[PDB]
Structure formats: C-alpha cells, structure tokens
Write a protein that binds this ligand. Structure first.
Ligand code: NI
Length: 341
C-alpha cells in the first residue's frame, strides 16, 4: 500500500509510486528521476500515463521498454495542464533528467515536491520566486548538521589534478571510476577531458549514457576499452581483488591503477578537508573515496527552506524511525523560529 507522503491531496496524482500495484484513484503517475528506489515497479506492461522529463522518458522507453503511448514528457520551466491541474517541472540539480514538481491545486494551495535534489541559491531565481508555497515534500537525506561536504566544483578540481599528476608521472597508469546508476557523470568526463582520452565502458552503460542529451557525447565515450585510458566499472568491482582482476585483462598495456569511488557522505568528512584526502593503497593499486554529493548538505537544505518559508514540511527520506522523524521535526522548528515565518 502506497504511503501518504507519495500522494498529492486534491488530485488524482502520485509521485514515485510504481511498486504498489494499481493505486486507488490515481489518474497520473509522476516520476521525478530515473533511480531504482523511485522507478521500482515500471516495465513494458505498465499501462497508465507516466509524467516526467524528456531525459527520464528516454530512459523509460530504451532501458525499461515502457511503451511510447504511456510516456508523457514535459518541458522544464513551462506551465502545463495535466488532467485539469496546472504543473511546472523544475531542474532538481540531482542526476540527469531529475526534476522538482510544482502543483497548483484547484482550491488555491501550492505544493512543491523536491524529488531528490541538491539545493542551490540559483533555485531562488526560478519560477519559485513568483508565488507562495504552502506545502513542501522535502528530500531530507542529509538533514543533520554533521553532514557537511565540499562543492561539486572543489571535488572535480581534486579529481582532475590527482589523475593528471598520476598519469603524467606514469603514462602506463590506468584510471578506473566506479558507477551503479546515472548521476555523477562529471567525475569521469572531467578526468577523461584532462587526459585527452574517451571514457571506455560496457555496452549496457554506453546505452544508458546515450539517452541523456549530454552535448558532444559521441566525442567523449566509447565501447572500445582498448583505445581508452579511463575505464568505467560497476561500483562493486572497485576494491583490490576486482581491480587486480581488471588489470590482468588489459594485456600488459598498464602497470598501475588509480581508481575513484564517488560516495555520498562518509564520517571522514567530519575531520578531513578535500585537500587532505588520501587513498587506500595495495601494491600498484590506489583507491580514492571522493565525497561527490547529488543531495543537499544540511546548510544548503536549511538555506533553501528558510528562503521558501513553507507553511508545512513533509519529509520524504528517513521517515521509517521515530528518532529520525523527531530529529527532523526539531530542526524544522529551529529554522522557522530563527527566520520568523
Ligand atoms: Ni536519487
């Protein structure tokens, strides 16, 4: 059964609710982004209207085989009427094709559903600026002050400089980057660009990337692993055993691996600056964990909410325990008392 925080009151709409069977009273199913916890349940046999971004719709059609007649892509930053209700999709600064959804209810209530997002001050000048929001359905993944991490630009600077130094010292070094979903493509594209290489990967991953409307992508990626010195592998293979094994396969072309694991937050964030990050090493293999996040830090979240001044907050993440829920509700009240709304 579909939980309440996936339903939009006063509509026939649900958000990211594909794993509950036919939801009683739902006339349109919205999908915020192509991540498995959110799309769980979609397939070629789905026969209800799905509303999403263009990029999400490419992935539904080519990866899950959903039939074209049930895919309804909407442009961003554009007022659209869906089953008699005005909606707008906004960029969520999450993975490719990820959106927030603004719903303008027939009774005058305005609801923002963030999906998964990384709040940014640029959002304070979107179509959000133009009216009041009553209810906020909020990605609370990192809603606690211990969760700090650097900007995406500082992390990519660290990665490019690390990779370029290593391969200039040793032209026979291979760089490997882990992946298990869409998102974080800047990691591997930036390093390949500094090295003058395409990124090599499996056919299944090349197919996924070809659905993303990234400019000039044919110039940056390839399935010919032999011609590439940046390889993508599944995140589970980024360990000493899996990397030793991969290095065998390259036929003595390479004699060293430098590998990156873009994680979210890890507790090494509480003590160490990005400048100070060191790898784990074993022999001719080094593994860097880099804190590249596509979710808001605690401070980015707080700034967005204090700017928006919603009348009510509904968390969408960490809702399964009473301790989490009580912690989140305490921070929400702090933020409201500090800002005065
Ligand atoms: Ni996500």
């Amino acid at each position: 059964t579909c939980p309440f925080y996936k339903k939009i009151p006063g509509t026939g709409f649900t958000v990211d609710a594909f794993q509950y069977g036919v939801v009683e009273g739902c006339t349109a199913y919205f999908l915020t982004h192509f991540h498995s916890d959110h799309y769980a349940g979609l397939s070629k046999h789905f026969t209800f209207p799905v509303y999403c971004s263009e990029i999400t719709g490419n992935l539904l059609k080519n990866k899950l085989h959903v039939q074209e007649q049930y895919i309804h892509p909407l442009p961003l930053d554009t007022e659209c009427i869906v089953n008699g209700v005005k909606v707008v999709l906004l960029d969520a600064n999450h993975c490719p094709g990820a959106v927030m959804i603004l719903f303008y209810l027939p009774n005058g209530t305005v609801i923002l559903h963030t999906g998964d997002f990384r709040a940014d001050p640029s959002m304070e000048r979107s179509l959000l600026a133009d009216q009041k929001v009553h209810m906020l359905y909020l990605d609370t993944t990192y809603c606690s002050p211990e969760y700090t991490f650097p900007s995406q630009q500082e992390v990519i600077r660290f990665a490019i400089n690390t990779a370029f130094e290593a391969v200039t010292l040793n032209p026979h070094a291979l760089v490997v980057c882990g992946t298990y979903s869409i998102g974080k493509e800047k990691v591997f594209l930036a390093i390949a660009d500094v090295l003058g290489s395409k990124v090599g990967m499996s056919q299944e991953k090349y197919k996924t990337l070809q659905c993303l409307n990234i400019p000039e992508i044919n110039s940056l990626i390839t399935t010919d692993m032999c011609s590439s010195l940046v390889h993508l592998l599944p995140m589970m293979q980024i360990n000493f055993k899996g990397l030793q094994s991969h290095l065998k396969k390259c036929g003595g072309k390479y004699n060293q691996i430098l590998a990156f694991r873009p994680t979210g937050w890890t507790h090494s964030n509480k003590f160490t600056r990005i400048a100070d990050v060191i790898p784990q090493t074993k022999g001719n293999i080094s593994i860097y964990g880099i804190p590249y996040s596509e979710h808001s830090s605690y401070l980015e979240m707080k700034r967005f909410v204090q700017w928006l001044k919603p009348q009510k907050i509904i968390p969408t993440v960490n809702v399964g325990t009473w301790k989490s829920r009580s912690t989140m509700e305490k921070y929400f009240r702090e933020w409201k008392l500090e800002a005065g709304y």
